[PDB]
Amino acid sequence: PTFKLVLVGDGGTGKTTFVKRHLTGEFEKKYIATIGVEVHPLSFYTNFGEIKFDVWDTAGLEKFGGLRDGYYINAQCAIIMFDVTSRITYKNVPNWHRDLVRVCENIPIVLCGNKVDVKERKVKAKTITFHRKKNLQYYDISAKSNYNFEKPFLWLARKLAGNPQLE
Amino acid sequence: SAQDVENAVEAALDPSVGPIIKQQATDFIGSLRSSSTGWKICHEIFSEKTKYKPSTRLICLQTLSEKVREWNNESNLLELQMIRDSVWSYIKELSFLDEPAYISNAVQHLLTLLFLQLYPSNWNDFFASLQGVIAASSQSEFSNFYLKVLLSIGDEIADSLVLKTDVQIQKDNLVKDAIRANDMSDIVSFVYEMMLAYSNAKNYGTVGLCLQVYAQWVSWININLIVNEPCMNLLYSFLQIEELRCAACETMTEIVNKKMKPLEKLNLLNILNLNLFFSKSSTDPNFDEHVAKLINAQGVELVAIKSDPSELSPELKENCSFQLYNLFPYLIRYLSDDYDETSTAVFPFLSDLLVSLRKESSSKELSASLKEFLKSLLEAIIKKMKYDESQEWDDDPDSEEEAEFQEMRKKLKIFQDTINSIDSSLFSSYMYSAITSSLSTAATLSPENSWQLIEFALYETYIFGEGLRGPDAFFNEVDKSPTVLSQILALVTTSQVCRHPHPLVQLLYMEILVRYASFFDYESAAIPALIEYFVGPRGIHNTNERVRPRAWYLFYRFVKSIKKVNYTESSLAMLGDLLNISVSPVTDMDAPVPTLNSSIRNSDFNSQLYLFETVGVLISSGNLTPEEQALYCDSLINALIGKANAALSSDLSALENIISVYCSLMAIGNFAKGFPAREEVAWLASFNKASDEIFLILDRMGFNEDIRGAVRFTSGRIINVVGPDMLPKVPQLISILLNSIDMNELVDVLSFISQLIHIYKDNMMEITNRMLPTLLMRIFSSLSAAPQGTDDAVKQNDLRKSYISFILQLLNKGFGSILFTEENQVYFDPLINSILHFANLVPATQKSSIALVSKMVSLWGGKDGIAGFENFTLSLTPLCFEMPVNQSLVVLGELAGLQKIILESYLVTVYFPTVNFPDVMASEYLQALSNLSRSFKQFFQKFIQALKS
RNA sequence: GCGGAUUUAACUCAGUUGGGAGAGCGCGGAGGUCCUGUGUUCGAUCCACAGAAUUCGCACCA
Ligand SMILES: Nc1nc2c(ncn2[C@@H]2O[C@H](COP(=O)(O)OP(=O)(O)OP(=O)(O)O)[C@@H](O)[C@H]2O)c(=O)[nH]1
Ligand SMILES: [Mg+2]
């Protein structure tokens, strides 16, 4: 039971880090902009079985995102990530959504505000309204402290399996 | 080239390939956008269905769309037109759009962009022709396609959400007016017929899409087209069809939110005769959430209409206020709905209503009629506030449910606080009986299933008097009679509550005891149980995991605030079982190898540190003779020191020995963090013996920085305890810590220094001199390093902050002379520029950095000796007049201050001449500096906004 | 729909980029939780975050 999950967000929001954290457990402190797309088969366990997620880590950099929307083809789910430290990475969250749905008619989209470990916050909590205007699941998360790091996958898995009881 | 692209894309879409192949591919496709010719290749593919892959056509379609974005009308009206006829010939055929969804969706996207560049003038027939085709080929699949194009056009012209450019907006408003002035009447007529047609045919799919277009577009189109008799009738009907019920309530709403003149909504709002729908509105929560949202929509409107003083006709005020009081039943019915999604869909209406309500009670007293309403509102709000008496509490601190609940409580409280505003006595009484009532009922239940009711009782209590902390919260400022707070608190402290097993209950109890400890300032005879409570097996020795740690902090806060007397000895005795430290090395997420950090981060040691601090507060505010107090003092410092010596002498490398040493130093540091600053106190001797012990451990483990933080910390506490009795060894401390200095501790270091610079001001001067040279070049080096990641940028800003604040301290405490001691001569120039650089960065960097830059001028006000304070002073000019070209007032406000201080010239001869010379503005600036602190600021802000505009 | 200001004794206004805070007026003295809550620090009125009250724009509906 493998599902295609495209991960998209603005550049520097921590998409790749998020991935590494779950693939190896390591937290990369240096920023190396992803180029094109990197794809890793992150997997998981559940009361009912093993769900695999083929994650398509996309680049959110205008410079290195060749085939920008192409990668969303036949995607089965997705995560839209933004940086709580960087304001504009939220101001653009609509787009990422708009684009994603243009290719994938109706898929379970999870909106994630990353970097919540850093105290100060440029994207204040009163501005985060997109998920409630687009009926989208949201999660304040952190690739550094692992804060809520499994919420996004669990939710999706619980939908792609239609089994709310899934864990 | 075609078959190539088809491969490239195919290459990129297969992650089962070598990177080498992807590179070429990924760049080939991206080359298409960059290239002047690239798109010609996609122009040929997108239409080709018999020979190309959807996967390919997609990437070509997308390309083409991005390409259509950047072509200026006038300069490319040939290519834009060229790609249109192509898309249109394609769209006309109707035989490939029933390909996969992405291929139809992406088509829509291109067309709309095309439309966006040609419609006003170049594409006159866009709606006539497109519609004529959609109608000609009579099939839903096609109507849907059309419907979505309309939604897409709205996405690009009605969505407030996307980047709000002033241009795109002026460019967007044109397309709106064009559509308005040309084919709006028919766009709506077209849609209508479809709603009507597919409606009778029971084709709910398309009717849905229709209802959306109406929802989306109502925001910005002639309302009249939408609110005619025949179309409305069709809607009200949809309000009774399971399949269409919701879309209908969503569009119904939009019609209601369409913005207009207050007298204008009233009619519309009236004409919709929506109350009957409300009257009926069964178990479908999604729907109820829709109805709620509609009621809320209508509610928020009417309240805003009733507050405008514009049209004074009470006719308006009568029907408007009549319709509002009419909505009240509903507002309560849904506010109380068990489903939390539903109730919240009305908060905004409640929010505004209440506001309007206390604006009206500021004039006259509320009507018996309303006093009930509020009372009935509280009845609801109270219901939402309680835990569900069905699902047992989750011991999961990560349960999204508990997080969503706490959010609603945070809101449900402001509703109570506003109600309070409208009538504090109505709220007061009502809450007292709610808390009393709830506790009464709790006693009639098996402990296992009574907690929800108690947790709610102690919750309201906990909040009832938040902020109300003056002796007036407890007793009437005139009769001196008790306050409903005093009465609620009393009840609770006297209630059995404290004997209940449940966590939420026990915690919340201690929280209440801490928060309102001042209450007990009067009833001093009641303190022993509160102290014995924390102490006993429920409060501090609790067998619950979350409570035990959290308990120790509260007891410390409680004791800290409840100092007088007679509970000293027993409290100290009971703490005993809890003071021996046992931190074990543990594995972590970031530590395959247990780290002092990981080991400790998983212990309750940080929390336990409060006990040590407590035990020190008990011993300084307790009825214990100098002998007895000094006895406990030296009995604990010798046991800790002792745990350090045994740990130090064994293998210093062991994490266990390291941990052991760290904690022993931390506990002693927190023990001293409870004693009062340096009269001869008993503890002094005992704390001075401990000071020597730091060096002992600093000598052997000074290598490890963890121990170093623990040292910079503990010694600062002891210095704030001993004071001058340590001053002679301060330099030996400073010196050691310096060499093991790192980059991670450049900030723990700076504060340790000013911490001391404060305790002994003049004394620390000479030490700082010999040390500034080291601290400076380190800071200079880590701040010059452009960050390679978030954490880096984070570590930098913090440094930036303390660095400036350090230098501000130096100057404000009288240290400037040290910067000049030859040890730091080569360092003056860059220090100033350092600060000058932080000011031109982008506010925290500019308001405080610009401020430091100013004091630096006042302290060095004469060319006498400072050979780089003129050019520096003068160099600050471009900052004061060019920075703000590319929060901002504090930025500009202090930018002026620098101007002023300098001002108490070189600008006339030298500055204006370099920059484009503004004769008018150049003399108004000198007039401001010369003849206007307050006045000059004004000139300056208005001045620049002007210079900039 | 975005975006900013404001909120210090009875009164009335000052003022610091965190070291405990005041002049006029008003009963030799007296009188403030420096809007609230939470956090970060050895410590905050002055920092971070969350919120309230008062309020000024800009955009959309036009
Ligand atoms: N403090 C903190 N920093 C984070 C977190 N996630 C990411 N970062 C920082 O952001 C950097 C990683 O950004 P990336 O994940 O590489 O950004 P990216 O995903 O490659 O951006 P794309 O290449 O467009 O996908 C790291 O250096 C981290 O310091 C987080 O959860 N907490
Ligand atoms: Mg990436």
PDB file of N, CA and C and ligand atoms in Angstrom, chain A residues 15-16 34 38 57-59, ligand 2:
ATOM      1  N   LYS A  15      11.440  21.700   4.251  1.00  0.00           N
ATOM      2  CA  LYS A  15      10.856  20.493   3.674  1.00  0.00           C
ATOM      3  C   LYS A  15      11.818  19.299   3.715  1.00  0.00           C
ATOM      4  N   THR A  16      13.026  19.496   3.197  1.00  0.00           N
ATOM      5  CA  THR A  16      14.048  18.457   3.146  1.00  0.00           C
ATOM      6  C   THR A  16      14.460  17.977   4.523  1.00  0.00           C
ATOM      7  N   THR A  34      17.399  22.410  -2.197  1.00  0.00           N
ATOM      8  CA  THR A  34      17.149  21.224  -2.992  1.00  0.00           C
ATOM      9  C   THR A  34      16.990  21.691  -4.423  1.00  0.00           C
ATOM     10  N   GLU A  38      13.957  15.601  -4.900  1.00  0.00           N
ATOM     11  CA  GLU A  38      14.640  14.453  -4.318  1.00  0.00           C
ATOM     12  C   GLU A  38      13.495  13.541  -3.897  1.00  0.00           C
ATOM     13  N   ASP A  57      10.071  15.301  -2.402  1.00  0.00           N
ATOM     14  CA  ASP A  57      10.558  16.561  -1.881  1.00  0.00           C
ATOM     15  C   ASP A  57      10.808  17.513  -3.059  1.00  0.00           C
ATOM     16  N   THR A  58       9.938  18.507  -3.222  1.00  0.00           N
ATOM     17  CA  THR A  58      10.079  19.481  -4.304  1.00  0.00           C
ATOM     18  C   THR A  58      10.884  20.709  -3.877  1.00  0.00           C
ATOM     19  N   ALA A  59      11.469  21.399  -4.843  1.00  0.00           N
ATOM     20  CA  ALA A  59      12.222  22.596  -4.521  1.00  0.00           C
ATOM     21  C   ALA A  59      11.257  23.765  -4.596  1.00  0.00           C
TER      22      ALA A  59
HETATM   23 MG    MG D   2      13.841  20.370  -0.315  1.00  0.00          MG
END
